[PDB]
């Protein structure tokens, strides 16, 4: 089903919650800015086509709570991503499209 | 309701079809690359906050048919936009959020 991922947990941690989501090809994932802004979504290119990873990324930073970004995943695969400003804190995620 | 806008008409014209869509605040619009690529979505900032217009834009160019971009409009207003490479051809659109 379509998935919603919180950027910054309710418990106040620099994480994507849930960190791993599984969807069906053709579905979308919406990231909603929650706590400890700012955040962004950058997909790494290992295991998936470099250009697809780029098209799925949203490099602009989100500041206000409730702001969101949506990406539609039409091709099956394992897409790992991260929040640039919080990479050191380990704010990483994964989307499995089947 | 959620709206889908074709970038490049079935009749083979450099236009957004439908050029004007009306949605309810909170809903989203999905632009799907159809014909005469490439295309992108850039919202102009007159009548709406400059930063909101930027957050709604998708500057990257789409080439393959079926590729898409999604933007969620949570704030009411009239958002006019255009396709950068086809501005001269008059490829412009409008989203009315109520
Ligand atoms: Cu972050
Ligand atoms: Cu165009």
Swiss-Prot record, chains A, B:
Query: Where does this polypeptide localize?
Result: Cellular thylakoid membrane
Membrane topology label? Peripheral membrane protein
Induction info reads: By copper.
Entry superkingdom? Bacteria
The residues the record assigns to binding Cu cation are 39, 83, 86, 91
Instruction: Identify which cofactors the protein needs according to its UniProt entry.
Output: Cu(2+)
The molecular function terms of the Gene Ontology recorded here are: copper ion binding; electron transfer activity
Q: Which UniProt keywords apply?
A: Copper, Electron transport, Membrane, Metal-binding, Signal, Thylakoid, Transport
Q: Could you tell me which residue ranges the Plastocyanin-like domain spans?
A: 1-98
Membrane-spanning residues:
none
A cellular component term (GO) from this record? Answer: plasma membrane-derived thylakoid membrane
Q: What does this protein do?
A: Participates in electron transfer between P700 and the cytochrome b6-f complex in photosystem I.
Per the similarity annotation, which family is this?
Answer: Belongs to the plastocyanin family.
Protein name per the record: Plastocyanin
**Species of the source:** Synechocystis sp. (strain ATCC 27184 / PCC 6803 / Kazusa)
Q: Which gene encodes it?
A: petE
């Amino acid at each position: 089903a379509n998935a919603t991922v919180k950027m910054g947990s309710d418990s106040g941690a620099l994480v994507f919650e849930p960190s791993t989501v599984t969807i069906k090809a053709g579905e979308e994932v919406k990231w909603v800015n929650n706590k400890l802004s700012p955040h962004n979504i950058v997909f790494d290119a290992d295991g998936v086509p470099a250009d697809t990873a780029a098209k799925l990324s949203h490099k602009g930073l989100l500041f206000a709570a409730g702001e969101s970004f949506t990406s539609t995943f039409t091709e099956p695969g394992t897409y790992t991503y991260y929040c640039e400003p919080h990479r050191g804190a380990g704010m990483v995620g994964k989307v499995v499209v089947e």
